[PDB]
Amino acid sequence: VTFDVGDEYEIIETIGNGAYGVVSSARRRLTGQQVAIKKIPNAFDVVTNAKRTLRELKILKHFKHDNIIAIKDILRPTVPYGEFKSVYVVLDLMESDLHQIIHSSQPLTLEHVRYFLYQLLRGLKYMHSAQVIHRDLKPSNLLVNENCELKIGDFGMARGLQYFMTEYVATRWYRAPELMLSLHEYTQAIDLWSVGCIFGEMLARRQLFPGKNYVHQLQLIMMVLGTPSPAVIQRVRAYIQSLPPRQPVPWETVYPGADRQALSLLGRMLRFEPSARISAAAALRHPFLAKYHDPDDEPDCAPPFDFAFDREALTRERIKEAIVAEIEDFHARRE
Ligand SMILES: COc1cc(C(=O)N2CCC(N3CCN(C)CC3)CC2)ccc1Nc1ncc2c(n1)N(C1CCCC1)c1ccccc1C(=O)N2C
């Protein structure tokens, strides 16, 4: 079967795969309400993964927000603690993600784009007030349904306030320059870079900076934003120091026929300097999102999120203990 849940849920279809692991749509037995169930097959075998899972449970259990994917249940172990391998999390089931929507024959008007961006930023304002950087925002991590309701998901990369830049890789289309040309101060401005990229992706329905490798990535950014001012720098320095004085291409020539306000907002997000970028809070006060802006319906998260548990260097078994403790804690609060 490979999905041995109880009689509380009824599996419908298998939707697909995270890197680890499996997501099936289901139906709660008593309410008939549709949920999504993620099985994590060997959740405690690999220290790095177990750490991700623990991290992601804590952040989701901390957040209550219409624009951030949510945990509805975590299933108890149905076997002894020693034998417990696979963890099942019940989450909000959405109908698609934003990647499928952008890259489809269906039409995508500015009204869609405007509404999708508003929800994204409303979600991030809450996160960032909790002092949680998402770090991996992309359209496939933005879940969506028929009535354009949007939810941010996948917090496995999230961080408070090692990794290596491998060359031949095309997986950094939404990564902020500070994570590339490694500056020593990483803040929540990181997500607003990715938002800019995502935003722009919707306006053209095609990737803004689709780099094929590490270098092609920095080239593509430079081709639009120009060279970063000397001050905005400091081995890696050399590659850029000697490259003809590049000027920023205006966003109007990048997107011909686009909306004046949309670009004003976009231009406040895609900027090398992390401090130069708008915050999510401020972005919501932009004319572009004026239709939707409601001060009394765009809350912060309090208290903020402690990352103590993450810093601590834990064994494989001690992370299993902590994850199990999150499951027991989850049920204690509800029941
Ligand atoms: C029917 O629901 C969806 C379809 C799709 C979708 O259109 N595709 C395109 C075709 C994809 N192929 C890869 C898998 N193969 C079986 C062929 C289909 C599946 C994803 C995307 C998101 C969907 N909805 C969805 N709802 C909830 C999700 C989630 N996705 N997912 C997806 C669950 C499938 C893989 C990820 C999430 C994605 C990012 C972050 C969080 C989640 C998440 O935790 N949940 C619970």
UniProtKB/Swiss-Prot annotation:
Domain Protein kinase as annotated: residue spans: 9-289
Keywords associated with the record: Acetylation, ATP-binding, Cell cycle, Cytoplasm, Differentiation, Kinase, Nucleotide-binding, Nucleus, Phosphoprotein, Serine/threonine-protein kinase, Transferase
Motif, TXY: chain positions: 166-168
GO biological processes: adenylate cyclase-activating G protein-coupled receptor signaling pathway; calcineurin-NFAT signaling cascade; cell differentiation; cellular response to growth factor stimulus; cellular response to hydrogen peroxide; cellular response to laminar fluid shear stress; cellular response to transforming growth factor beta stimulus; intracellular signal transduction
Catalytic site: 136
Keyword Nucleotide-binding attached: yes
Molecular-function GO term, any one: ATP binding
Intrachain S-S bonds: none
Binding, ATP: 15-23, 38
Notes concerning its domains: The second proline-rich region may interact with actin targeting the kinase to a specific location in the cell.
Protein name as it appears in the record: Mitogen-activated protein kinase 7
Species in which this protein is naturally found: Homo sapiens
Residue range from the parent sequence: 47 to 393 of 816
